[PDB]
Design a protein around this ligand. Structure first.
Ligand SMILES: *[C@@H]1O[C@H](CO)[C@@H](O[C@@H]2O[C@H](CO)[C@@H](O)[C@H](O)[C@H]2NC(C)=O)[C@H](O)[C@H]1NC(C)=O
Ligand SMILES: C[N+](C)(C)CCOC(=O)CCC(=O)OCC[N+](C)(C)C
Ligand SMILES: C[N+](C)(C)CCOC(=O)CCC(=O)OCC[N+](C)(C)C
Ligand SMILES: *[C@@H]1O[C@H](CO)[C@@H](O)[C@H](O)[C@H]1NC(C)=O
Ligand SMILES: *[C@@H]1O[C@H](CO)[C@@H](O)[C@H](O)[C@H]1NC(C)=O
Ligand SMILES: C[C@@H]1O[C@@H](O)[C@@H](O)[C@H](O)[C@@H]1O
Lengths: 534, 536
C-alpha cells in the first residue's frame, strides 16, 4: 500500500495507481464517482450528488463511457476510431479522473479541468488524446476530467417540465466542478486556481459556464479551443428542443409531458440513439440533435444576448482555432467529398454543399455565401471550390463565432489571448487536403509527442512542450507568456482595436492582426442584417 | 483664290473650305476647324433630330473653332485650372453643330486611318475645341487623320418625351451619328480612309461609343472602338422611357410650361439659359455621378437596354480597346459628399462615409447601402479616416466606371469581340488637384492626345516618352486592331482580355505589366450580388 496513492475525499477513501510518464511517475485516480448513477427514473433528470461509500474505492481504472452513438463511416480507421469509445458504454457513466504529480505537490497547484467535445452527442474522458499524465509530470499540474451525459441522455428537453428540464449534461459538468472545489485540495490541487479548458462542444460548454452565474464561483479562468456558446450549432431554443424531443418520442412509439417522458424512460438506451439523427430539420453537417437549450435558467437568455450584455472584468480567456476547421465535416454529408480521394468538386457540387453546410440559410443568403467564397479568377477550379467549401463550414461554425466572442469579451473587460493553430501532425491518417483538421491540436496540448513510442518527430516534441507551457502558464497566471523567460516574441492580448493573435506552429510565435476580419464581418454583420430584413 | 496656301483648300459635299496651317512641335499640320455638319438646331429645331447641312456658296472659312453647345459651366472653384480646363473655351450657342479635322501637312498621299473623338462631360457638357482634345500631335507624329464633332448636351441633346414626334430623345447621339456619316462621305477629301475609322472617347464620350456599337445604323459608319473610363451599360449613362418623361415634364413645370406637342412647343419658347438654370433640379435623389438628361432607352436608337443588348449581341466582328484610370471616383466626391474638398485632405468620419454612400449609390436600398459599407470597410481599421476617404472614392469609381467596364469587357469577349483592357496609373506631374485624388477621371486624355510633346506645357521628359508610347498603342490599334507593334518584339506584349484569363495591362512610366482580373472580387459584388439582392 503506497501512501501517495491513498486519498480521502468527502465520500470516502480512494486508491489510485502509479503511472509511468516519460520523465517520471504520476499518481492517477481514475473512475471516481461524482454523482448517483443517472439510471432508471433519473434519466433526463439533473444529477444528484454521490452517496458516500465504505472502505477503499478502487480508482485505478477508467470507468464506462456515457451512452452514445459510435461512428462507423470508416471501420478500423485510426482517424475516426481515435474518437470512438474505448471503454464499455453505459448510462452509469458519471465518473471523473485526476492526475497529480508523484509525490503529490508540496504546495497547492493550479488545476486544469478538461471538458471533452464531440457535438454534445459523443466523447469520453478516457480517450488517449486526453491523457493528463504528461501535463502532470512535466508541468506539475493537477489535471481533472469528467464524463458528462451526451445525446438524448444529456440534452433531450421538454422545456418547463420537471422531469426533462434540459441541460442536464451541463449540470453534470457543474457537479464535477463542485466536486473539485470540495475535494481537490486532498490531491494537492488549489481550488482557488481552476482553469476550465475544452475543445469543440467542450469549448462551447466552457463558454456556457462563463455565461451561467452558479458556475462562476467554481473556476477562475477559461480556454475555449475551436468552440463557442454563441454560434449556429451549440444551442437550440426552447421551442426547437421541444419539437425534437417530441419527434423522437413519436419515432420510438411514445406515448402531457409527464406521460411522454415516462414512456421515453422505459426505452432501451440504443432505441433512443437509433433515432437520434432523424430529428434534425434539414440535411446538414456540423449540426447536432440534442444540445444545450436556452431554458431561461442555466442560460438566462441566448448566448448572443448574454455575451453582448455581460461584464467580464475579472476574467481571463484563451481562445483559438485550427487552420482547417471545416474539412473534417465535409466527408460526413457533402456529395463529392471523401478521405480516400482528393475531393476535387464541381461548381454545382459547391452550390449544393453550401445548402448543406449552411442549412438555415435562405436561397439569397446561400447565394451570397457562394458569391463571397468564389475566386472569380478561378471560379470553376475544383481545388479552389473544394478548399472554399471547407472554409465556408469552418468559418460559419467556428472561426467567425470565435472572432465574435473574442471581441465581445475583450470589449467588456476580459483579458483575452487568441491563437490559430497551424501544425499538421506528422502521424495524421486523414488525407493532405483536409489540412490541420478540427481536433488535431489537442494531442500537442496534452503532450502526447513526449511519448517516444508514438512516432512523433523531435520538432513536434519540442513544439508540444511549448504548448504545454503556454496552457499551464495561462492556468498559473492568466497569461500564457513566461514570467521569467526566453523572451522577445511575446504573445499579446487580443483587443478589439488591434485584433492581435498568434500562429501556433513549429516556427517561433508570429503576431498577426485580424482573425479573418473581412469574412467574419460578412458572417457576423451582413448575414444577420440580411435575413432580419430580406 | 490665288495668293493663298494651296495645301489648305479642300472641297467637301457642302462646298469649298479653307483650313489653317498649325505648328506642332515636330512640324506643321493642316486643320479644318468649325465645319458645319448640320443645319443649326435652333428655334423650331430645338429637341429635334439633326438635319444635314445644306450646301454653301463660296469658300467657308475653317480656320477657327466654332461655338460650344449651350451648357452648364462649372462654378465650384473659380480660376482653378483643375476645373477651368474642362470649361467652354468658345462662346455658348445652340448653333453649335460643327466638326473639326486635323491632318498631316501636306495631306497624306495614300488613305490614312481616321480616329474620331467623342468628348465626355456627363452628357451635359463638353466641347471638341478644348486644348486637351487638340489633334495636332497625333496628326503630326502618327500621321493620323483626327476628327472631333460637337454634339448637343443637356436638355438640348437629351430631353425626351418618349414616343413624341417633336422631342423623341437621343438627338445628341443623332448629332454624333451625322458627323460619322459626314466622315464617310467626305474624309477622303482630306486623305482619310473611310474604310478604317476607329472611334474613341472618354466618360459620356465612351458611353456614346458603346451606344454606336449597340445601335445598328451606326455600325456601318466605323470599324473599331476605344472606350475610356465609360460604358453604355451601368448606372448613369441611360434612363428608361418613363424616367426620361418624368424628368422632361418636371423641367417643363419648373420653367413655366404645362399633350406633348403643346408642352414641347412651350419649351421651345424658353431662353436656353432658363433650361440650363433648372436642369439640375430634376434628379430623383441627392447624388453624384448622375446626370439629368442622358440617352434614353427608346426602342429606336437603343432597341433595348444596354444590358440586354450586350448580353444577347454577336460581336464577332468587333475589335475594342477599353480601360480605366486608377482613381475614377475621387473627382466626384468634392461635388456633393459632405467632408470632401480639394483644399484639404478630406479625412472623413465613419458617419460621413455612410452618408456619402447614400449619395454615391443613390438608387440603393438601405440593405444594399449597408452591404456596400460592409464590403468597403477595412475591419482592421474601421474608423481610420484615410481608409474611409479612399473607400468612398473606390465606391463611386467602382460602381460607376470600373465594374461596368469589367462587365462590358467580359460580355464582349464572351461573345466574339477581340478586347484589350488597361488601367492607367500615371498621375500627371502638372496636375493641380490635390494628391489624395490620385489619378482622377479624365487625366489620361492629355497623354493619349500628346500634349506633353509641347515643351511650353512643362511636362517631364519621361512624360513625353510615355505620351509617345500611348499615342502609338492607340494608333496601332486604329490601324490594325492590335495595339502592339509587329516589328518590335523586345517590348512586353499587351495580350487580349479573355474571360478565361482576364488579362489587362498597367499604363505607367514603366514598361507594360500584365495583370489578371480587373477588380474581380469587388465587381462580383456589384455585378452579381447586388442585382440578385434587387430581385427581392
Ligand atoms: C475639408 O473641407 C471640407 C469642406 O468645407 C470640410 O467639410 C465640412 O465638414 C463639416 C464638419 O464635419 C461639415 O459640417 C460640413 O458639412 C462639411 N462641408 C461640406 C459641405 O463639405 C471638412 O471639414 C474639411 N476637413 C477638415 C477637418 O479640415
Ligand atoms: C471532432 N472530433 C474529432 C472530436 C470527433 C470527430 O467526429 C465526427 O465524426 C465529425 C462529423 C460529425 O459531427 O458527424 C455527426 C453526424 N453523424 C452522427 C451522422 C455521423
Ligand atoms: C470631363 N471631366 C469628367 C474630365 C471633368 C468633369 O467635371 C465635373 O464637373 C465632374 C463633376 C460633375 O459631374 O458635376 C456634376 C454636378 N454639377 C452638375 C452640379 C456640377
Ligand atoms: C471521390 O470519392 C467519393 C466516394 O466514393 C465519390 O463519391 C466521388 O465522386 C469521388 N470523386 C472523384 C471525381 O473521384
Ligand atoms: C511653365 O514653366 C515656365 C518656365 O519656368 C513658366 O514661366 C511658365 O509660366 C509655365 N507655364 C505653364 C503652362 O505652367
Ligand atoms: C479647408 C476647408 O475648405 C472648405 C471650407 O468650406 C472649410 O470651411 C475649410 O476651410
Amino acid at each position: 500500500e503506497d501512501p501517495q496513492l491513498l486519498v480521502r475525499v468527502r465520500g470516502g477513501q480512494l486508491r489510485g495507481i502509479r503511472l509511468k510518464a516519460p520523465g517520471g511517475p504520476v499518481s492517477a485516480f481514475l473512475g471516481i464517482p461524482f454523482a448517483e448513477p443517472p439510471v432508471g427514473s433519473r434519466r433526463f433528470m439533473p444529477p444528484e450528488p454521490k452517496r458516500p461509500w465504505s472502505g477503499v474505492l478502487d480508482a485505478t481504472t477508467f470507468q464506462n463511457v456515457c451512452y452514445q452513438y459510435v461512428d462507423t463511416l470508416y471501420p478500423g480507421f485510426e482517424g475516426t476510431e481515435m474518437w470512438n469509445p474505448n471503454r464499455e458504454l453505459s448510462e452509469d457513466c458519471l465518473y471523473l479522473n485526476v492526475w497529480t504529480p508523484y509525490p503529490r505537490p508540496a504546495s497547492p497547484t493550479p488545476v486544469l479541468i478538461w471538458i471533452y467535445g464531440g457535438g454534445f452527442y459523443s466523447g469520453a474522458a478516457s480517450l488517449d488524446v486526453y491523457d493528463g499524465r504528461f501535463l502532470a509530470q512535466v508541468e506539475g499540474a493537477v489535471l481533472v476530467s469528467m464524463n458528462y451525459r451526451v445525446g438524448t441522455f444529456g440534452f433531450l428537453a421538454l422545456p418547463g417540465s420537471r422531469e426533462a428540464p434540459g441541460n442536464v449534461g451541463l449540470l453534470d459538468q457543474r457537479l464535477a466542478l463542485q466536486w473539485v472545489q470540495e475535494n481537490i485540495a486532498a490531491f494537492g490541487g488549489d481550488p482557488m486556481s481552476v482553469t476550465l479548458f475544452g475543445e469543440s462542444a467542450g469549448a462551447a460548454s466552457v463558454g456556457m459556464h462563463i455565461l451561467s452565474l452558479p458556475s462562476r464561483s467554481l473556476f477562475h479562468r477559461a480556454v475555449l479551443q475551436s468552440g463557442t456558446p454563441n454560434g449556429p450549432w451549440a444551442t437550440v431554443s426552447a421551442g426547437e428542443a421541444r419539437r425534437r424531443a417530441t419527434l423522437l418520442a413519436r419515432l420510438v412509439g411514445c406515448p402531457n409531458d409527464t406521460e411522454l417522458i415516462a414512456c421515453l424512460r422505459t426505452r432501451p438506451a440504443q432505441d433512443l440513439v437509433d433515432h437520434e439523427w432523424h430529428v434534425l430539420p434539414q440535411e446538414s453537417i456540423f449540426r447536432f440533435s440534442f444540445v444545450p437549450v436556452v431554458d431561461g435558467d442555466f442560460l438566462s437568455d441566448t448566448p448572443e444576448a448574454l455575451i453582448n450584455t455581460g461584464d467580464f472584468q475579472d476574467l481571463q480567456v484563451l481562445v483559438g482555432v485550427v487552420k482547417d476547421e471545416g474539412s473534417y465535416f465535409l466527408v460526413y454529408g457533402v456529395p463529392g467529398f471523401s478521405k480516400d480521394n482528393e475531393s476535387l468538386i464541381s461548381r454545382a457540387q459547391f452550390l449544393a454543399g453550401v445548402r448543406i453546410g449552411v442549412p438555415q440559410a435562405s436561397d439569397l443568403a446561400a447565394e451570397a455565401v457562394v458569391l463571397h467564397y468564389t475566386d472569380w479568377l478561378h471560379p470553376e477550379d475544383p481545388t479552389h471550390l473544394r478548399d472554399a467549401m471547407s472554409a465556408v463550414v469552418g468559418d460559419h461554425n467556428v472561426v467567425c463565432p470565435v472572432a465574435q466572442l473574442a471581441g465581445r469579451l475583450a470589449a467588456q473587460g476580459a483579458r483575452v489571448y487568441a491563437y490559430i493553430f497551424e501544425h499538421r501532425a506528422s502521424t495524421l491518417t486523414w488525407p493532405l487536403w483536409m489540412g490541420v483538421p478540427h481536433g488535431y491540436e489537442i494531442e500537442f496540448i496534452f503532450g502526447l509527442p513526449l511519448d517516444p513510442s508514438l512516432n512523433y518527430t523531435t520538432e513536434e516534441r519540442i513544439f508540444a512542450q511549448r504548448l504545454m507551457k503556454y496552457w499551464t502558464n495561462f492556468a498559473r497566471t492568466g497569461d500564457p507568456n513566461d514570467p521569467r523567460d526566453s523572451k522577445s516574441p511575446q504573445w499579446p492580448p487580443y483587443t478589439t482595436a488591434a485584433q492581435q493573435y498568434v500562429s501556433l506552429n513549429l516556427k517561433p510565435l508570429e503576431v498577426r492582426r485580424g482573425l479573418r476580419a473581412q469574412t467574419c464581418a460578412f458572417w457576423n454583420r451582413f448575414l444577420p442584417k440580411l435575413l432580419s430584413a430580406t
